[PDB]
Every structure is written in C-alpha cells, then in structure tokens.
Design a protein around this nucleic acid. Structure first.
Lengths: 91, 98
DNA sequence: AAATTTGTTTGAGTGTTGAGCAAATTT
DNA sequence: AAATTTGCTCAATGTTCAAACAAATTT
C-alpha cells in the first residue's frame, strides 16, 4: 500500500512500518500541545521547510548532484529545483 | 533565560535510542528515513512525482490536525497556516476534507 | 441581533513551466 | 569528441492572494 513509511519498535522489540503521515501528525500533536494558546503564524511554511530540506538532500544524494535527473525524479522543473536549492542554501 | 530551540527541534517525534531510552528527534529525520526506505525498495524503475508524493503525504496530516485544532474553522486555520483561505479550501477539497 | 464565517467571484501579481542556447562538465 | 548537464534567459499559462459581498452560522 504505502510507499512512504518509517520504522518503529514496540515493547516486544518488533520492528514495524508506519506511514510517514503518522509521524507528521505526531510532530504536530506535540507542537500544538507545547504551546498553550500562543498564536501560530506560518505553519505551512514551517512544515514545508522541514520536509523540503531532507527531500532535496536525499535526491541530490541519490542522483550524485545531477540536478537534471533530480528534477525528473521529483516531477518538478529544473528551474524550480534550482530555486528550492538556493532557498535552503544548499548548492 | 530562554534556551535556544533550533528549527529542526520544533517538530519532533518520539524515537528509541541505542540504550532503550525515549528521545525526541526532528521530523526531518522521519522524512529522511522514509525516503531511504523508498529508494532501497526501488529495484529499480523510474520515479516521476516524488515531490507530489511527499507533499501529499505531508499536507494531509497537516490539514487534518489544523482543522481539528480550529474545530472546523477555515478562517482560523488559514490564518495559522499562513496561506489564503481560498487555497486552504482548494487543498481541503483535494484531500476530501469536507 | 451582532459578530463571525462560509462560499463564491474577480483581477492582479507571483510562481512554475518548457524551451532554447553557449559554456562547462561528464562520459 | 560526443553527450550530458549547467546556468541563464524569456513569456506563457497557472496558482495564490486580498478584497469584496450576500447567505449562512455561531456567539
């Protein structure tokens, strides 16, 4: 079913997959808990930053720096990818 | 008086370390691992929408959690996410969240 | 009944996209 | 030396955005 999963362990030392989306939910449940009513302001840019960084890092690494193959693999434009790389200061 | 909390440490997850101890690690790391397992399971065809894939996988829970928090209030949701209320409605539609 | 939110349009600005092309770099 | 990739344009189609405003709803 799900292609994007992470590894978990239980009290019985069994390793099991769980969708990445469950991780995201958790991170946010924790985030919302920690702040009692303080305002949130740029949650989309925050999450997006947290997720775009390790995605570029991983596909630049898998394509050995090849921006072209990177951009193909991601389904985005070579220019967009240059943009995002610059935005996170990884180039 | 205020300890620094680096950005990688704002969205974190409970993990277990080499000593059976519960510890927070960045959400970054969860994304990395998911992607490592996805690359490993690639034996070895082409990919052409890794961005839309990851993005959907992340937008869904984010929308899900924010709506729950604002108790269905689309206006508050849009304000706290920092996007236009129109695109919030668009995204909610895209994932069937209405 | 007041205040807020929803649902929808409209038009401007910003963004993504392909394509193209010499220079650089990899094969 | 051939092929591929980079870096950089340009303009064109699409997305995001705020601003309305009446209808619906929540306080």
């Amino acid at each position: 079913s799900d292609v994007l999963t992470v590894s978990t362990v239980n009290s019985q030392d069994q390793v099991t997959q769980k969708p990445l989306r469950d991780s995201v939910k958790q991170a946010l449940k924790n985030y919302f808990a920690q702040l009692n009513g303080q305002d949130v302001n740029d949650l989309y840019e925050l999450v997006l930053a947290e997720v775009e960084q390790p995605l570029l890092d991983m596909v630049m690494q898998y394509t050995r720096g090849n921006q072209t193959r990177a951009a193909l693999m991601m389904g985005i434009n070579r220019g967009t990818l240059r943009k995002k790389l610059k935005k996170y200061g990884m180039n």
